[PDB]
Amino acid sequence: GRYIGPVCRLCRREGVKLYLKGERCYSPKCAMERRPYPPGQHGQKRARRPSDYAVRLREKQKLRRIYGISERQFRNLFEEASKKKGVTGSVFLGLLESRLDNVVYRLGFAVSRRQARQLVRHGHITVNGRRVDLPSYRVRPGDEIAVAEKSRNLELIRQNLEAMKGRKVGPWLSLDVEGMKGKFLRLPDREDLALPVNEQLVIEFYSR
């Protein structure tokens, strides 16, 4: 499914500016920079005080639509995190960040997460030399996420890695722009992520 369709309507409905197109969510064209109200005929009307279930559902939907992961994989990852020892929320965020498509996005190979998903699915991304075409692939600490030697001549990768010159990467990632590769150093901490999501709200949403 992948929800494929309009994206900045989620930028509007969630009330927080999301980055689903990469660019144009920074440019004054996101429609969140100019239309912050939710979509539909009844978007500009006075909003009623939402229920607690409303708040938790909206927060979980925000966190899910940020990564573009379906409800099935999302709930499975949450249950997997809850089975493990440690804080459920931080482990859940580390699991979501460990996805191959999200790592490709974080490493600057793609401008958006869905563009990264298409780059992975089409075999333009390799892991430790071997080609991997699975967005749900879990990257372990130490894996070298590289670009296919046959794909390093493509225009989009040239553009993205030409813009990545001088740009800093996450504290848990390393980037080699000349070799067009990177390394997943460690699992990111909660302080490492600046996501506008309260993970405890999602934990309480699935606690029901």
Residue 35 near RNA by CB under 7 A:
yes
With CB under 5 A as the contact rule, the residue among 13, 25, 96, 201 that binds Zn ion is 25
Query: How many whole angstroms separate alpha carbon 20 and alpha carbon 156?
Result: 17
Minimal distance in Å, beta carbon 193 to RNA? 20
Which of 11, 32, 66, 88 is in the footprint of Mg ion by CB under 5 A? 88
| Helix or strand (DSSP H, E) at 145 | strand 144-147
Among positions 1, 4, 6, 8, the unique one binding Zn ion when judged by CB under 5 A: 8
Q: How far is the CB of 7 from Mg ion (least distance, A)?
A: 8
115-174 binders of RNA (CB under 7 A) = 115, 117-118, 121-124, 127, 130-138, 150-151, 154-156
- Applying CB under 5 A, does 104 fall inside the site for Zn ion? no
